[PDB]
Amino acid sequence: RKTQPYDVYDQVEFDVPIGSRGDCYDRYLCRVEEMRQSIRIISQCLNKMPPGEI
Amino acid sequence: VKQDMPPVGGYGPIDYKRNLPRRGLSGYSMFAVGIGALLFGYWSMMRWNRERRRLQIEDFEARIALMP
């Protein structure tokens, strides 16, 4: 997403969790923080919706 | 007329913070309630053991006096 713009991802801002060292627990924490940052991206996308065309 | 779907005046923010209030206690509180209730139980059962040994000696005086 943040390395290759293939859609309107260049105009939205978030952060993505990276792993400490292995440890499936940390992978679980990574999933949960991607969920909460997904909620932030949806809030930004409702802030930036133009009524142009279908 | 055009009646598509825009938002209404800009939507309010939605939180991103961990509402984890760390509902707490203390080791001093654990120490106080544990040693208090524990020593309370010790003293109470100690006094009941003393009254119960009174009863037990009474039962023995019954069986000794009856026996011959």
mmCIF file of N, CA and C in Angstrom:
data_model
loop_
_atom_site.group_PDB
_atom_site.id
_atom_site.type_symbol
_atom_site.label_atom_id
_atom_site.label_comp_id
_atom_site.label_asym_id
_atom_site.label_seq_id
_atom_site.Cartn_x
_atom_site.Cartn_y
_atom_site.Cartn_z
ATOM 1 N N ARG A 1 0.822 -1.203 0.000
ATOM 2 C CA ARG A 1 0.000 0.000 0.000
ATOM 3 C C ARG A 1 0.857 1.253 0.000
ATOM 4 N N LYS A 2 1.710 1.401 1.008
ATOM 5 C CA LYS A 2 2.494 2.618 1.096
ATOM 6 C C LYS A 2 3.760 2.568 0.260
ATOM 7 N N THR A 3 4.084 1.431 -0.352
ATOM 8 C CA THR A 3 5.185 1.430 -1.305
ATOM 9 C C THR A 3 4.735 1.536 -2.753
ATOM 10 N N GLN A 4 3.503 1.134 -3.078
ATOM 11 C CA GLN A 4 3.028 1.177 -4.457
ATOM 12 C C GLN A 4 1.603 1.704 -4.544
ATOM 13 N N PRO A 5 1.416 2.933 -5.018
ATOM 14 C CA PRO A 5 0.057 3.461 -5.182
ATOM 15 C C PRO A 5 -0.651 2.848 -6.376
ATOM 16 N N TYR A 6 -1.627 1.980 -6.125
ATOM 17 C CA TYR A 6 -2.440 1.410 -7.188
ATOM 18 C C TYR A 6 -3.880 1.901 -7.163
ATOM 19 N N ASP A 7 -4.220 2.774 -6.224
ATOM 20 C CA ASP A 7 -5.548 3.347 -6.028
ATOM 21 C C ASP A 7 -5.360 4.627 -5.215
ATOM 22 N N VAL A 8 -6.410 5.072 -4.527
ATOM 23 C CA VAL A 8 -6.387 6.370 -3.855
ATOM 24 C C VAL A 8 -5.693 6.283 -2.484
ATOM 25 N N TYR A 9 -4.989 5.169 -2.222
ATOM 26 C CA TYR A 9 -4.150 5.007 -1.029
ATOM 27 C C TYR A 9 -3.096 6.094 -0.832
ATOM 28 N N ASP A 10 -2.701 6.803 -1.892
ATOM 29 C CA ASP A 10 -1.751 7.901 -1.750
ATOM 30 C C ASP A 10 -2.315 9.096 -0.985
ATOM 31 N N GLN A 11 -3.632 9.206 -0.862
ATOM 32 C CA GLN A 11 -4.258 10.354 -0.229
ATOM 33 C C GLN A 11 -4.736 10.072 1.184
ATOM 34 N N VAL A 12 -4.575 8.849 1.675
ATOM 35 C CA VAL A 12 -4.992 8.504 3.028
ATOM 36 C C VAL A 12 -3.759 8.177 3.857
ATOM 37 N N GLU A 13 -3.884 8.351 5.176
ATOM 38 C CA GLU A 13 -2.752 8.258 6.090
ATOM 39 C C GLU A 13 -3.089 7.362 7.270
ATOM 40 N N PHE A 14 -2.167 6.465 7.592
ATOM 41 C CA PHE A 14 -2.341 5.458 8.629
ATOM 42 C C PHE A 14 -0.951 4.976 9.034
ATOM 43 N N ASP A 15 -0.902 3.913 9.832
ATOM 44 C CA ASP A 15 0.346 3.201 10.067
ATOM 45 C C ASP A 15 0.048 1.720 10.237
ATOM 46 N N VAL A 16 1.036 0.893 9.916
ATOM 47 C CA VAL A 16 0.880 -0.553 9.861
ATOM 48 C C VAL A 16 1.875 -1.184 10.825
ATOM 49 N N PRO A 17 1.459 -2.129 11.667
ATOM 50 C CA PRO A 17 2.400 -2.724 12.620
ATOM 51 C C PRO A 17 3.336 -3.731 11.975
ATOM 52 N N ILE A 18 4.581 -3.708 12.434
ATOM 53 C CA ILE A 18 5.625 -4.623 11.997
ATOM 54 C C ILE A 18 6.000 -5.476 13.205
ATOM 55 N N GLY A 19 6.512 -6.676 12.950
ATOM 56 C CA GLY A 19 6.763 -7.605 14.027
ATOM 57 C C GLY A 19 8.045 -7.326 14.782
ATOM 58 N N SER A 20 8.009 -7.612 16.085
ATOM 59 C CA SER A 20 9.224 -7.554 16.883
ATOM 60 C C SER A 20 10.207 -8.629 16.452
ATOM 61 N N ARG A 21 9.919 -9.887 16.816
ATOM 62 C CA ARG A 21 10.762 -11.056 16.523
ATOM 63 C C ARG A 21 9.872 -12.300 16.584
ATOM 64 N N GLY A 22 9.433 -12.773 15.414
ATOM 65 C CA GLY A 22 8.686 -14.028 15.326
ATOM 66 C C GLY A 22 7.382 -13.967 16.100
ATOM 67 N N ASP A 23 7.173 -14.975 16.960
ATOM 68 C CA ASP A 23 6.268 -14.878 18.105
ATOM 69 C C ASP A 23 4.805 -14.598 17.768
ATOM 70 N N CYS A 24 4.058 -15.619 17.333
ATOM 71 C CA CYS A 24 2.642 -15.583 16.932
ATOM 72 C C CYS A 24 1.706 -14.670 17.735
ATOM 73 N N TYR A 25 1.971 -14.515 19.034
ATOM 74 C CA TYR A 25 1.332 -13.477 19.846
ATOM 75 C C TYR A 25 1.504 -12.089 19.237
ATOM 76 N N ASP A 26 2.726 -11.770 18.811
ATOM 77 C CA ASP A 26 2.979 -10.484 18.178
ATOM 78 C C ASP A 26 2.283 -10.385 16.828
ATOM 79 N N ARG A 27 2.141 -11.512 16.130
ATOM 80 C CA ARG A 27 1.376 -11.547 14.890
ATOM 81 C C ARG A 27 -0.099 -11.253 15.148
ATOM 82 N N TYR A 28 -0.620 -11.747 16.274
ATOM 83 C CA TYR A 28 -1.980 -11.431 16.691
ATOM 84 C C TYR A 28 -2.147 -9.944 16.977
ATOM 85 N N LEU A 29 -1.186 -9.360 17.697
ATOM 86 C CA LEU A 29 -1.214 -7.920 17.944
ATOM 87 C C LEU A 29 -1.135 -7.125 16.649
ATOM 88 N N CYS A 30 -0.383 -7.641 15.673
ATOM 89 C CA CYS A 30 -0.318 -7.022 14.354
ATOM 90 C C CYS A 30 -1.678 -7.027 13.665
ATOM 91 N N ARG A 31 -2.406 -8.147 13.762
ATOM 92 C CA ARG A 31 -3.748 -8.215 13.186
ATOM 93 C C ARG A 31 -4.698 -7.221 13.845
ATOM 94 N N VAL A 32 -4.651 -7.125 15.176
ATOM 95 C CA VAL A 32 -5.568 -6.237 15.893
ATOM 96 C C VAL A 32 -5.280 -4.771 15.568
ATOM 97 N N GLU A 33 -4.001 -4.408 15.460
ATOM 98 C CA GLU A 33 -3.704 -3.019 15.138
ATOM 99 C C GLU A 33 -3.985 -2.691 13.678
ATOM 100 N N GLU A 34 -3.867 -3.669 12.769
ATOM 101 C CA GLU A 34 -4.355 -3.431 11.411
ATOM 102 C C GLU A 34 -5.864 -3.225 11.379
ATOM 103 N N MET A 35 -6.607 -3.891 12.272
ATOM 104 C CA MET A 35 -8.049 -3.659 12.366
ATOM 105 C C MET A 35 -8.367 -2.232 12.792
ATOM 106 N N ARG A 36 -7.708 -1.765 13.851
ATOM 107 C CA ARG A 36 -8.004 -0.422 14.348
ATOM 108 C C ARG A 36 -7.576 0.650 13.349
ATOM 109 N N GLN A 37 -6.453 0.430 12.664
ATOM 110 C CA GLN A 37 -6.052 1.388 11.645
ATOM 111 C C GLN A 37 -6.936 1.305 10.406
ATOM 112 N N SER A 38 -7.553 0.146 10.157
ATOM 113 C CA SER A 38 -8.566 0.058 9.113
ATOM 114 C C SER A 38 -9.777 0.912 9.457
ATOM 115 N N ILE A 39 -10.149 0.952 10.742
ATOM 116 C CA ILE A 39 -11.238 1.833 11.169
ATOM 117 C C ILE A 39 -10.865 3.299 10.961
ATOM 118 N N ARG A 40 -9.598 3.640 11.199
ATOM 119 C CA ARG A 40 -9.158 5.013 10.937
ATOM 120 C C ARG A 40 -9.195 5.361 9.448
ATOM 121 N N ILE A 41 -8.826 4.408 8.584
ATOM 122 C CA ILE A 41 -8.869 4.650 7.141
ATOM 123 C C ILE A 41 -10.310 4.824 6.665
ATOM 124 N N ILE A 42 -11.239 4.053 7.237
ATOM 125 C CA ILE A 42 -12.650 4.204 6.886
ATOM 126 C C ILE A 42 -13.199 5.552 7.355
ATOM 127 N N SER A 43 -12.736 6.045 8.509
ATOM 128 C CA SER A 43 -13.130 7.382 8.954
ATOM 129 C C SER A 43 -12.615 8.467 8.006
ATOM 130 N N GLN A 44 -11.357 8.343 7.561
ATOM 131 C CA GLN A 44 -10.812 9.288 6.583
ATOM 132 C C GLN A 44 -11.554 9.217 5.250
ATOM 133 N N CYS A 45 -11.931 8.008 4.830
ATOM 134 C CA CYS A 45 -12.609 7.836 3.552
ATOM 135 C C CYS A 45 -14.027 8.384 3.591
ATOM 136 N N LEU A 46 -14.694 8.312 4.744
ATOM 137 C CA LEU A 46 -15.962 9.019 4.878
ATOM 138 C C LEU A 46 -15.753 10.523 4.948
ATOM 139 N N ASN A 47 -14.582 10.966 5.415
ATOM 140 C CA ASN A 47 -14.288 12.393 5.372
ATOM 141 C C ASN A 47 -14.015 12.896 3.959
ATOM 142 N N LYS A 48 -13.613 12.024 3.035
ATOM 143 C CA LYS A 48 -13.148 12.454 1.711
ATOM 144 C C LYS A 48 -13.907 11.754 0.584
ATOM 145 N N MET A 49 -15.234 11.799 0.620
ATOM 146 C CA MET A 49 -16.041 11.176 -0.427
ATOM 147 C C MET A 49 -16.669 12.221 -1.342
ATOM 148 N N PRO A 50 -16.258 12.323 -2.604
ATOM 149 C CA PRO A 50 -16.887 13.289 -3.521
ATOM 150 C C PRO A 50 -18.083 12.676 -4.227
ATOM 151 N N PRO A 51 -19.150 13.449 -4.462
ATOM 152 C CA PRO A 51 -20.340 12.913 -5.152
ATOM 153 C C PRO A 51 -20.307 13.121 -6.667
ATOM 154 N N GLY A 52 -19.301 12.547 -7.322
ATOM 155 C CA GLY A 52 -19.148 12.751 -8.752
ATOM 156 C C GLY A 52 -19.987 11.898 -9.685
ATOM 157 N N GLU A 53 -19.712 10.596 -9.734
ATOM 158 C CA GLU A 53 -20.292 9.721 -10.748
ATOM 159 C C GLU A 53 -20.051 8.286 -10.305
ATOM 160 N N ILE A 54 -20.809 7.361 -10.890
ATOM 161 C CA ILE A 54 -20.747 5.953 -10.530
ATOM 162 C C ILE A 54 -19.680 5.245 -11.353
ATOM 163 N N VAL B 1 -32.110 17.942 -10.763
ATOM 164 C CA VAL B 1 -31.431 18.064 -9.480
ATOM 165 C C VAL B 1 -30.541 16.847 -9.239
ATOM 166 N N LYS B 2 -29.531 17.011 -8.389
ATOM 167 C CA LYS B 2 -28.576 15.954 -8.084
ATOM 168 C C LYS B 2 -28.665 15.630 -6.604
ATOM 169 N N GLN B 3 -28.902 14.361 -6.286
ATOM 170 C CA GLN B 3 -29.150 13.920 -4.917
ATOM 171 C C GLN B 3 -28.333 12.679 -4.588
ATOM 172 N N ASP B 4 -27.025 12.728 -4.834
ATOM 173 C CA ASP B 4 -26.149 11.599 -4.530
ATOM 174 C C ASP B 4 -25.870 11.494 -3.036
ATOM 175 N N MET B 5 -24.829 10.762 -2.660
ATOM 176 C CA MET B 5 -24.577 10.533 -1.240
ATOM 177 C C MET B 5 -23.287 11.196 -0.749
ATOM 178 N N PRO B 6 -23.300 12.476 -0.372
ATOM 179 C CA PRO B 6 -22.162 13.042 0.344
ATOM 180 C C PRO B 6 -22.379 12.929 1.840
ATOM 181 N N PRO B 7 -21.336 13.146 2.661
ATOM 182 C CA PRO B 7 -21.560 13.235 4.111
ATOM 183 C C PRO B 7 -22.210 14.542 4.535
ATOM 184 N N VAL B 8 -22.420 14.702 5.838
ATOM 185 C CA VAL B 8 -23.170 15.825 6.387
ATOM 186 C C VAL B 8 -22.199 16.662 7.215
ATOM 187 N N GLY B 9 -21.694 17.747 6.621
ATOM 188 C CA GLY B 9 -20.853 18.717 7.301
ATOM 189 C C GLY B 9 -19.504 18.223 7.772
ATOM 190 N N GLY B 10 -19.065 17.050 7.327
ATOM 191 C CA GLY B 10 -17.853 16.448 7.846
ATOM 192 C C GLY B 10 -18.157 15.619 9.075
ATOM 193 N N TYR B 11 -17.862 14.324 9.029
ATOM 194 C CA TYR B 11 -18.182 13.455 10.150
ATOM 195 C C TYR B 11 -17.194 13.651 11.288
ATOM 196 N N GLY B 12 -17.668 13.399 12.505
ATOM 197 C CA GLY B 12 -16.843 13.493 13.682
ATOM 198 C C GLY B 12 -15.819 12.379 13.748
ATOM 199 N N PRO B 13 -14.794 12.549 14.574
ATOM 200 C CA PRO B 13 -13.736 11.542 14.655
ATOM 201 C C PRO B 13 -14.182 10.308 15.426
ATOM 202 N N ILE B 14 -13.521 9.197 15.117
ATOM 203 C CA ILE B 14 -13.772 7.910 15.748
ATOM 204 C C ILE B 14 -12.464 7.469 16.391
ATOM 205 N N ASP B 15 -12.537 7.031 17.645
ATOM 206 C CA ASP B 15 -11.344 6.881 18.465
ATOM 207 C C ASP B 15 -10.469 5.716 18.006
ATOM 208 N N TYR B 16 -9.211 5.770 18.444
ATOM 209 C CA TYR B 16 -8.196 4.783 18.105
ATOM 210 C C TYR B 16 -7.345 4.445 19.324
ATOM 211 N N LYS B 17 -7.848 4.707 20.522
ATOM 212 C CA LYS B 17 -7.070 4.573 21.739
ATOM 213 C C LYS B 17 -7.627 3.431 22.577
ATOM 214 N N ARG B 18 -6.726 2.678 23.195
ATOM 215 C CA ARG B 18 -7.087 1.490 23.955
ATOM 216 C C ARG B 18 -7.683 1.930 25.284
ATOM 217 N N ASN B 19 -9.009 1.844 25.406
ATOM 218 C CA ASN B 19 -9.704 2.165 26.655
ATOM 219 C C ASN B 19 -9.478 1.015 27.632
ATOM 220 N N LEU B 20 -8.274 0.976 28.190
ATOM 221 C CA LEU B 20 -7.877 -0.053 29.148
ATOM 222 C C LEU B 20 -7.491 0.657 30.435
ATOM 223 N N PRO B 21 -8.396 0.754 31.411
ATOM 224 C CA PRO B 21 -8.188 1.674 32.535
ATOM 225 C C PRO B 21 -7.237 1.170 33.608
ATOM 226 N N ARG B 22 -6.641 -0.016 33.410
ATOM 227 C CA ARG B 22 -5.842 -0.791 34.364
ATOM 228 C C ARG B 22 -6.483 -0.804 35.752
ATOM 229 N N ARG B 23 -7.667 -1.426 35.833
ATOM 230 C CA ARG B 23 -8.444 -1.564 37.061
ATOM 231 C C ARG B 23 -7.622 -2.288 38.117
ATOM 232 N N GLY B 24 -7.173 -1.551 39.126
ATOM 233 C CA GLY B 24 -6.033 -1.957 39.914
ATOM 234 C C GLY B 24 -6.332 -2.363 41.341
ATOM 235 N N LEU B 25 -5.307 -2.940 41.964
ATOM 236 C CA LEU B 25 -5.254 -3.228 43.388
ATOM 237 C C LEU B 25 -3.841 -2.891 43.851
ATOM 238 N N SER B 26 -3.456 -3.394 45.020
ATOM 239 C CA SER B 26 -2.086 -3.222 45.475
ATOM 240 C C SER B 26 -1.648 -4.476 46.210
ATOM 241 N N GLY B 27 -0.330 -4.692 46.235
ATOM 242 C CA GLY B 27 0.220 -5.782 47.018
ATOM 243 C C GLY B 27 0.017 -5.589 48.506
ATOM 244 N N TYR B 28 -0.046 -4.332 48.952
ATOM 245 C CA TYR B 28 -0.343 -4.050 50.351
ATOM 246 C C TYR B 28 -1.779 -4.422 50.688
ATOM 247 N N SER B 29 -2.707 -4.211 49.748
ATOM 248 C CA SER B 29 -4.098 -4.589 49.982
ATOM 249 C C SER B 29 -4.262 -6.103 50.027
ATOM 250 N N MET B 30 -3.574 -6.817 49.124
ATOM 251 C CA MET B 30 -3.549 -8.278 49.153
ATOM 252 C C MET B 30 -2.993 -8.785 50.469
ATOM 253 N N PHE B 31 -1.858 -8.220 50.888
ATOM 254 C CA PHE B 31 -1.203 -8.607 52.131
ATOM 255 C C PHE B 31 -2.128 -8.387 53.322
ATOM 256 N N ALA B 32 -2.792 -7.226 53.357
ATOM 257 C CA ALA B 32 -3.667 -6.877 54.468
ATOM 258 C C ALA B 32 -4.875 -7.800 54.549
ATOM 259 N N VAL B 33 -5.630 -7.945 53.448
ATOM 260 C CA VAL B 33 -6.863 -8.729 53.531
ATOM 261 C C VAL B 33 -6.556 -10.219 53.674
ATOM 262 N N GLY B 34 -5.466 -10.699 53.063
ATOM 263 C CA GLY B 34 -5.144 -12.109 53.150
ATOM 264 C C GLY B 34 -4.670 -12.503 54.532
ATOM 265 N N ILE B 35 -3.697 -11.765 55.077
ATOM 266 C CA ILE B 35 -3.181 -12.120 56.391
ATOM 267 C C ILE B 35 -4.209 -11.812 57.478
ATOM 268 N N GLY B 36 -5.065 -10.805 57.266
ATOM 269 C CA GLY B 36 -6.109 -10.518 58.236
ATOM 270 C C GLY B 36 -7.161 -11.609 58.320
ATOM 271 N N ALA B 37 -7.767 -11.969 57.176
ATOM 272 C CA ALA B 37 -8.784 -13.016 57.183
ATOM 273 C C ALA B 37 -8.192 -14.371 57.538
ATOM 274 N N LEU B 38 -6.946 -14.616 57.134
ATOM 275 C CA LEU B 38 -6.281 -15.882 57.399
ATOM 276 C C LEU B 38 -5.978 -16.052 58.888
ATOM 277 N N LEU B 39 -5.430 -15.014 59.526
ATOM 278 C CA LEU B 39 -5.136 -15.105 60.949
ATOM 279 C C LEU B 39 -6.413 -15.056 61.780
ATOM 280 N N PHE B 40 -7.452 -14.392 61.262
ATOM 281 C CA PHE B 40 -8.777 -14.437 61.871
ATOM 282 C C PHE B 40 -9.321 -15.858 61.905
ATOM 283 N N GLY B 41 -9.206 -16.566 60.779
ATOM 284 C CA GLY B 41 -9.627 -17.956 60.736
ATOM 285 C C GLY B 41 -8.804 -18.842 61.648
ATOM 286 N N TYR B 42 -7.500 -18.554 61.761
ATOM 287 C CA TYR B 42 -6.632 -19.337 62.641
ATOM 288 C C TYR B 42 -7.025 -19.185 64.101
ATOM 289 N N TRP B 43 -7.247 -17.945 64.538
ATOM 290 C CA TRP B 43 -7.634 -17.708 65.921
ATOM 291 C C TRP B 43 -9.002 -18.302 66.229
ATOM 292 N N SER B 44 -9.948 -18.171 65.288
ATOM 293 C CA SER B 44 -11.298 -18.678 65.512
ATOM 294 C C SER B 44 -11.306 -20.196 65.627
ATOM 295 N N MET B 45 -10.591 -20.877 64.727
ATOM 296 C CA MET B 45 -10.581 -22.330 64.791
ATOM 297 C C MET B 45 -9.753 -22.824 65.970
ATOM 298 N N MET B 46 -8.765 -22.038 66.410
ATOM 299 C CA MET B 46 -8.001 -22.377 67.609
ATOM 300 C C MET B 46 -8.894 -22.398 68.846
ATOM 301 N N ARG B 47 -9.692 -21.341 69.024
ATOM 302 C CA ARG B 47 -10.595 -21.279 70.170
ATOM 303 C C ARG B 47 -11.658 -22.372 70.091
ATOM 304 N N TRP B 48 -12.107 -22.696 68.872
ATOM 305 C CA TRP B 48 -13.078 -23.779 68.752
ATOM 306 C C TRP B 48 -12.457 -25.142 69.032
ATOM 307 N N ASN B 49 -11.181 -25.341 68.679
ATOM 308 C CA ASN B 49 -10.492 -26.570 69.062
ATOM 309 C C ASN B 49 -10.379 -26.700 70.572
ATOM 310 N N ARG B 50 -10.179 -25.580 71.274
ATOM 311 C CA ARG B 50 -10.096 -25.654 72.736
ATOM 312 C C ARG B 50 -11.437 -26.044 73.364
ATOM 313 N N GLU B 51 -12.534 -25.420 72.907
ATOM 314 C CA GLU B 51 -13.862 -25.804 73.405
ATOM 315 C C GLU B 51 -14.207 -27.245 73.038
ATOM 316 N N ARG B 52 -13.730 -27.694 71.888
ATOM 317 C CA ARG B 52 -14.049 -29.032 71.439
ATOM 318 C C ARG B 52 -13.226 -30.077 72.184
ATOM 319 N N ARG B 53 -12.015 -29.726 72.623
ATOM 320 C CA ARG B 53 -11.282 -30.621 73.510
ATOM 321 C C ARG B 53 -11.920 -30.706 74.887
ATOM 322 N N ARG B 54 -12.541 -29.613 75.356
ATOM 323 C CA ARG B 54 -13.356 -29.693 76.574
ATOM 324 C C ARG B 54 -14.457 -30.735 76.424
ATOM 325 N N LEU B 55 -15.182 -30.674 75.299
ATOM 326 C CA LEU B 55 -16.218 -31.670 75.007
ATOM 327 C C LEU B 55 -15.652 -33.087 74.946
ATOM 328 N N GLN B 56 -14.461 -33.228 74.361
ATOM 329 C CA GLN B 56 -13.878 -34.545 74.130
ATOM 330 C C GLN B 56 -13.466 -35.194 75.451
ATOM 331 N N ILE B 57 -12.873 -34.403 76.355
ATOM 332 C CA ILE B 57 -12.552 -34.892 77.695
ATOM 333 C C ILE B 57 -13.826 -35.235 78.461
ATOM 334 N N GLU B 58 -14.915 -34.490 78.224
ATOM 335 C CA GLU B 58 -16.181 -34.842 78.871
ATOM 336 C C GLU B 58 -16.706 -36.200 78.401
ATOM 337 N N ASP B 59 -16.564 -36.488 77.103
ATOM 338 C CA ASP B 59 -16.954 -37.798 76.580
ATOM 339 C C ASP B 59 -16.109 -38.910 77.189
ATOM 340 N N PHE B 60 -14.824 -38.633 77.401
ATOM 341 C CA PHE B 60 -13.964 -39.628 78.032
ATOM 342 C C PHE B 60 -14.324 -39.869 79.484
ATOM 343 N N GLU B 61 -14.723 -38.822 80.200
ATOM 344 C CA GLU B 61 -15.144 -39.023 81.579
ATOM 345 C C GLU B 61 -16.423 -39.836 81.648
ATOM 346 N N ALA B 62 -17.310 -39.653 80.661
ATOM 347 C CA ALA B 62 -18.485 -40.517 80.536
ATOM 348 C C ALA B 62 -18.091 -41.985 80.365
ATOM 349 N N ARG B 63 -17.201 -42.275 79.403
ATOM 350 C CA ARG B 63 -16.890 -43.681 79.141
ATOM 351 C C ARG B 63 -16.072 -44.311 80.265
ATOM 352 N N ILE B 64 -15.238 -43.533 80.955
ATOM 353 C CA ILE B 64 -14.467 -44.103 82.055
ATOM 354 C C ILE B 64 -15.366 -44.375 83.250
ATOM 355 N N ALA B 65 -16.281 -43.451 83.558
ATOM 356 C CA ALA B 65 -17.142 -43.648 84.714
ATOM 357 C C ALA B 65 -18.132 -44.785 84.502
ATOM 358 N N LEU B 66 -18.553 -45.028 83.260
ATOM 359 C CA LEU B 66 -19.529 -46.092 83.042
ATOM 360 C C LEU B 66 -18.918 -47.491 83.111
ATOM 361 N N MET B 67 -17.650 -47.626 82.723
ATOM 362 C CA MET B 67 -17.078 -48.890 82.245
ATOM 363 C C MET B 67 -17.216 -50.152 83.121
ATOM 364 N N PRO B 68 -17.021 -50.142 84.460
ATOM 365 C CA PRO B 68 -16.965 -51.433 85.182
ATOM 366 C C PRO B 68 -18.275 -52.199 85.225
#
